[PDB]
Amino acid sequence: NNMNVIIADDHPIVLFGIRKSLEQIEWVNVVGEFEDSTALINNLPKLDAHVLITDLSMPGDKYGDGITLIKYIKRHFPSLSIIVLTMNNNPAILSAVLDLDIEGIVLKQGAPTDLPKALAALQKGESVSRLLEKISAGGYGDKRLSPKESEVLRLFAEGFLVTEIAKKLNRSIKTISSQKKSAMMKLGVENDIALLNYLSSV
Amino acid sequence: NNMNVIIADDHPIVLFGIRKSLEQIEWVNVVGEFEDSTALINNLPKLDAHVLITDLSMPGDKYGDGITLIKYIKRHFPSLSIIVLTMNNNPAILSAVLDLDIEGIVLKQGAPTDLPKALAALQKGKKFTPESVSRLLEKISAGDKRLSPKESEVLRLFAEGFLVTEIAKKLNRSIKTISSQKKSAMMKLGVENDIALLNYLSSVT
């Protein structure tokens, strides 16, 4: 069955590496490309799409990026099937990203044809099992974050301030402090330096 | 003249694009593709290559990533013309990189005709610097760029993991003294937030 696809990633050096990997398949039809949540959400109705290979960490002029952007597409577009393509190798973060309920998940640092082999696994009722059965079997199950803490820490390490994440997501510094201060105790780190060490070490 | 090119990035999907991209050019030939530092150094002598396309964010045991690495590549393999192709944007990083003298720097978050124009530029012994690159370069543009003793002394402890207050305590001075020196330093390097700073302090380690 002919399944049409849209792609979303901040890097066009990445996008131009996916579009070439999927045209191998004769039934696949890559209809649209985007680099931000704003232009993406705008041109979603105007283009018919069954499935989507969208990024985790992106620029969101208004409509936001990440688990925020995922569940706003899930709600306003249950029409679509979402595949999360991130460079985030971190378990603590990717933890709640699994629980989100997406079509399939693919890693950038995973072999190139991990994406076509999650376009088959979806077509017949992918690497969300291999991830979870590696993640749960890893020995970092005590460091399992919530869909908010994973969204908070992500943006902290991306190089935003606390108060800029509040402005990002519609909360107060008091709200976000708690979600980071909470997320830190889950990981068992006292300072930021030691936190970002556990957000690279993965 | 037809040149012999290498590619280096941990993300093989990025490697695929960069590999597929160089096929469009009739004189361009790719001799190698690598996923870390350790490997790039192994088959650096092995291949007859004039040019390299490398990430600053590449994993490796024996050799570092970014500045630490490019410093090794500039010295131990000097003949080679270099183009740095990274996601990264922390101006303090790119500052010290463009200081190691490379043909150019392609921001992986730039335009897709960056790398063609970057090889077209080096094909005529020049350096391409997109508006995306120019933008972040101005930050430090405004001795001067060089850090002070007590500033560098502080930054060391901040990176160690000692919070600002713990530094003041440890050295007999007020918080205001250290923040002045901490943020003074930051202002020199051309980094706003604590993240993009620590990212620099590791890139030069």
Next chain:
DNA sequence: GAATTAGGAAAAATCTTAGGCG
């Protein structure tokens, strides 16, 4: 000319504490 040192005003962040949910 800048380095090291701050002080008082100001901003950012953490700290209880506390209300309603699956």
Next chain:
DNA sequence: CGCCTAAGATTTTTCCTAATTC
């Protein structure tokens, strides 16, 4: 019950500004 959410009081940390002496 952990979860998001937050406003008090508090802390940390910057911001603005100006004193040292080389």
